[PDB]
């Protein structure tokens, strides 16, 4: 329920829009219970409230045929409320209209072309009088009294918010026309419609910001101080400035902006004037938000800077932060991309204690960003945006914007044999014939370069239990170790045990350990962090050890999550194998893992899993209690599991229905999962060879014989047949020998209980 | 440390606010006094906020 | 560091006191004979006894949750009365859990180590 | 079509491959109002004088909207800030960042630069 | 070449992994397969190759 601030609070005065059947520029049409529940009177105006704080006042009709949740409006009100169809509008009765003496309406500079005259005096001067038309500062209205859209923009009005045109409302048209490009810049401001894939972070920022500003009495009466500093960190190009502009257009509080290099670009002794000016100006008007963009430019680590004026700037910022009071109602938030580069005096309590992580968006966020950016592109029906979002793997939102740009540029270039560069104008058929196809996206995705591939991903896996064949015992056992301390804490409170933190899987290579980890992460709906062998070896050769602490901090930040260390035996196998060098069984990286593991609080839901293909050479200090405890053996799959593996590895390809997979699973005994995947892959490769070699004959025969070329047949080879499996089954092999399995069985028997104690019974003594 | 305990109490009271947010309106101008005085922080709020907090002294 | 002090494996009375001390958090049933357990085990250390107690508590939690799933399924399948409002099926862990958990115990310390 | 054109184009390669040649070629080609910035010519002037030249360049190019600004030898005027030890150089880098971010889609100005 | 330089077949006290081949494996596991980059490696003596390269996905 951490998202309940996003809800719009459905109320009986909330109205969806509707199309106006009355073409008056400021008319709405509502029912009689709507005009009696709020007591809306005809002759006065309602108070409509739309998006981005833009409001409007309109005359009302008693048209009862409109539904109880809808309200009718034309394009002029859809501009003045800044809403499309399907948008909710708050309505309020407003009998509080105070009139004006002199107003001054202004035209638009490109709409006044054609016939200038004074079309104000011709059409629009007796048009507002005695119709009780409500005007407002910012009214761009369509002109239906004239022959076409020679529009005016109502700019100057003696009441600043709005008024109804009175006989006292005297209008003057002497002023200059309004520019077009400035209004086009005005029409494209940013709300929460522009941000996608960050619902949780937007909820947290709304809870931290929108609630203390609208209602200080809640926090005065409960006696709880709201925070002062909110820090946004993430990779570059994730839209931090976008969220800043969104909340800036959202709140209506007095917003101020500070650009970091704009502060550092000025002379010595001048930038501090700008900082003090900013804080004094924001403390002049108490509901304020200060945003500081690119904070790391103006306050780095003081050990790195060598100027003294920079240290003076940092100390000035610290003083102005600590001088802020609870009286001022001022929230100071800042955004950087390097959370470690900041001077750590800024991290302290009362300066910047709220950290919000704007991470890399996953596939659903990618789809939402693509739907936001591609709303103004003429799109063909071939285009599957979900396929693109599945294929775009390492892209932040700016990379997706560049992807859409390059797709549209390729769509331009395909017409460039018709498009003339040298002529002055372009024909409108060439203009409107543009339609971006799937080939454009498949080009631009092959061309683009994602700048986020050096990043650890924190995502919920999609691998279910159905992909894994069998293994119901360890399925129940992993549910017992993971799912119940999350779901049922109270049972562990009623008794007196603490849940274990660790599991070690061991067995032959390629039997499904990674799939089990991803499956239990999918079952408990937790995040997943994978660390492979080469990353541990990279830390071992480079002797870098703060990275392990950074890994455990990243896993702490995304709780609940599982944390999967693949191939723990890699450093031991690299240093000496089993026979070793002159050393022992401890090293640097596993030591740092043990230090971080003994120090984590168990009330967090971080669970640690380590896989091993060779369990004898593991450091025995890990197997102590309080660490990785439960040893789980994963054998080679049996017949039913091989059936399910062969079924799961073929859902992508179309197979023929006469293929008997149960016969295959009966024939293979010592195969692992990798061997079955190898068989399926060789079958698909043979099928592709057959298809291409058949199509070459089609091309050669249809070019050699132009006689008919009429039949237009289907594929020679769809839906791969039993012949390809019979050919591909020759090249299969058992990758795991018998002595290896014997070794795993012997290590499994070394973990046997005491040979005894079966049929242990208490004395039944009455 | 003591500042972490102050932040813990803050997050517990914020969770106690959020459990009533299905009744609490953000869009209206005032809040009813029954919604005001109906606030009572429970053990579930502390068990939430203690699972959420991050101690900087480990 | 001067005084060398040898600490051997615990005897019967010490195993009694270890099994008593490791169970003050959990509610046990009063028909459990801990002295019989301490008489049966010879080469066990303290970690082995703690392992036995932990496996017993784990089996008890499995029994409790598996019993409550039947309650949920039956009360949703049969909305007929739902009136009795009984207590827990498994409070106060019984001798059956110790008899099951005592199968998986083992001596973690061999004889040649003690000889050394 | 509602698609923003790019703002910054960076040319990189080994020395002597004709980057300045391509700059002069497009400069004679387009007929748009071309302006040139030489890096050491900016760094050669006094403190507080080079920023006047940068602001003069961007204001002059924003006076005439179909413009191209070329900045030759960019690495002389904006190195890595960990390597520089003067503060006036960091002021120049921050001035360049501010004038780049202050550029709008209204201005129709393309800023391209060449380094090696 | 690196394996032959460090110990030949009999080796020193180490194993079969090193620094440069590790960095190759790290960069190879991280490339997107939608790019058309294809990787070929030649060997005059294939027994002393690190067996971690011969896994699938490589
Ligand atoms: N979540 C998002 N939804 C929609 N558009 C986005 C999103 N994230 C990024 N973009 C687009 O990418 C641009 C990047 O905006 P910026 O805020 O400048 O990026 P940034 O996250 O601030 O990184 P830096 O360090 O400031 S360059 C935005 O202007 C949008 O056009
Ligand atoms: N039980 C299984 N169910 C489905 N696919 C499996 C199973 N076991 C192995 N595979 C397949 O065989 C390959 C092995 O994947 P992994 O889970 O990584 O194997 P592993 O047992 O974890 O040991 P590695 O990673 O191969 S060294 C993948 O291509 C899987 O699709
Ligand atoms: N592709 C080319 N075609 C014709 N002449 C070329 C070409 N590349 C280089 N040259 C010649 O080599 C000269 C080098 O020009 P420059 O642009 O100064 O070299 P550069 O690539 O800019 O390297 P630096 O770093 O600026 S010295 C040109 O003036 C031409 O005379
Ligand atoms: Mg930004
Ligand atoms: Mg040159």
Residue numbers in the entry:
A (entry chain C): 12 to 777
B (entry chain D): 407 to 464
C (entry chain D): 639 to 754
D (entry chain B): 233 to 348
E (entry chain B): 581 to 638
Give passages from the manuscript.
The conserved ATPase p97 (Cdc48 in yeast) and adaptors mediate diverse cellular processes through unfolding polyubiquitinated proteins and extracting them from macromolecular assemblies and membranes for disaggregation and degradation. p97/Cdc48 forms a ring-shaped homo-hexamer, with each protomer containing an N-terminal (N) domain, two tandem ATPase (D1 and D2) domains, and a C-terminal extension (CTE). The D1 and D2 domains form two stacked hexameric rings with a central pore. Both D1 and D2 domains can hydrolyze ATP, but only the ATPase activity of D2 domains is critical for substrate unfolding.
Using the same dataset, we determined five structures of p97 in total: three SH conformations (I, II, and III), and two DH conformations (I and II). We imposed D6 symmetry on both DH conformers I and II and determined their structures to resolutions of 3.15 and 3.32 Å, respectively, according to the Fourier shell correlation (FSC) = 0.143 ‘gold standard’ criterion. The p97 DH consists of two identical single hexamers engaged in a tail-to-tail manner, with the two D2 rings directly contacting each other. The D1 domains of both DH I and II conformations are in the ATP-bound state. The D2 domains in DH I are bound to ADP whereas those in DH II bind ATP. The N domains of DH I are in the down conformation while those in DH II are in the up conformation, despite the fact that the D1 domains of both DH I and II are in the ATP-bound state. The main interactions between each D2 pair involve the α9 helix and the α8–α9 linker. The three conserved phenylalanine residues (F768/F771/F773; termed the 3F motif) in the CTE insert into the hydrophobic cleft formed by α6 and α8 from the adjacent subunit, with a buried surface of about 1200 Å2. Instead, the arginine finger residue R635 from the adjacent protomer contacts the nucleotide and the active-site residue E578, producing an active ATPase configuration. The pore loops in both D1 and D2 rings in the DH conformers are ordered and have stronger densities.
